[PDB]
């Protein structure tokens, strides 16, 4: 997250921290995700496309810190890693959405608590109007040039951009589709960045907190005329519905 503020898991209790175990024992951070039901985390396919093997991954819930344990956290193996069949990328990542079925060594899913809660999915094709302020959360870079990820969870606020504005050549041209959502800061001073992918774009939609988007792609970070691009969740409900029975 470029700019914004530091936070804890209590302020985004559905946030999932996804790690990969390497051949050798070392564990590295991959991407964020969102708990949508006790056994299901939703993320981005591009986070996993190169290493699609479920056994490599570890998922934490209730975790506020990157490389240290948070009191009350839960650790999970990935029982099933489901990637979107129609994924493709150019610069734009198409159909950038994945599902991770979570199971503890004890064979349990997520137990709701003060630091672990689910996020509601949106109603189909129901998104807030452009200019609406939404929040994004992640352990991603604080500066484009940074080598390290922050140790503490971060969040910021970006504003939804119309398909028409994001369509412009001096923005993203043809790269952005109707299945994607652009969001940015008016001054381009705050944004999601590398490491934030798979994480939640949350909007207040007719009274409730809603998983409107999933961090997907962008050209650099907090760059003028280059918004963050998010998978438009309300366009993938049938896909989410069928696959969450797998």
């Amino acid at each position: 997250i470029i700019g914004g503020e530091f936070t804890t898991i209590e302020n985004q209790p559905w946030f999932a921290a996804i790690y990969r175990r390497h051949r050798g024992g070392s564990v590295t951070y991959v991407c964020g995700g969102s708990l949508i039901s006790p056994c299901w985390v939703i993320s981005a396919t591009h986070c996993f496309i190169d290493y699609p093997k479920k056994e490599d991954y570890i998922v934490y819930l209730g975790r506020s810190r990157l490389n240290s344990n948070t009191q009350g956290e839960m650790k999970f193996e990935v029982e099933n890693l489901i990637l979107h069949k129609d994924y493709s990328a150019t610069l734009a990542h198409h159909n950038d959405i994945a599902l991770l079925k979570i199971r503890s060594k004890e064979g349990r899913c997520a137990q709701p608590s003060r630091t672990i809660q689910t996020i509601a999915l949106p109603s189909m094709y129901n998104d807030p109007q452009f200019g609406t302020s939404c929040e994004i959360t992640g352990f991603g870079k604080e500066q484009s040039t940074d080598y390290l990820y922050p140790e503490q969870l971060k969040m910021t606020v970006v504003k939804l951009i119309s398909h028409r504005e994001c369509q412009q050549p001096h923005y993203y041209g043809s790269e952005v589709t109707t299945k994607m959502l652009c969001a940015a800061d008016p001054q381009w001073k705050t944004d999601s960045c590398q490491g934030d992918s798979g994480g939640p774009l949350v909007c207040s939609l007719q009274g409730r907190m809603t998983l409107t988007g999933i961090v997907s792609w962008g050209r650099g970070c907090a760059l003028k005329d280059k918004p963050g691009v998010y998978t438009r969740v309300s366009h993938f409900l049938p896909w989410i519905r069928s696959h969450t029975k797998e």
Partner: peptide, 15 residues
């Protein structure tokens, strides 16, 4: 900043 430092290329072999 090259593509390997952008959102979209996390956990990629070429990176």
């Amino acid at each position: 900043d090259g593509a390997c430092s952008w959102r979209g290329l996390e956990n990629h072999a070429m990176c």
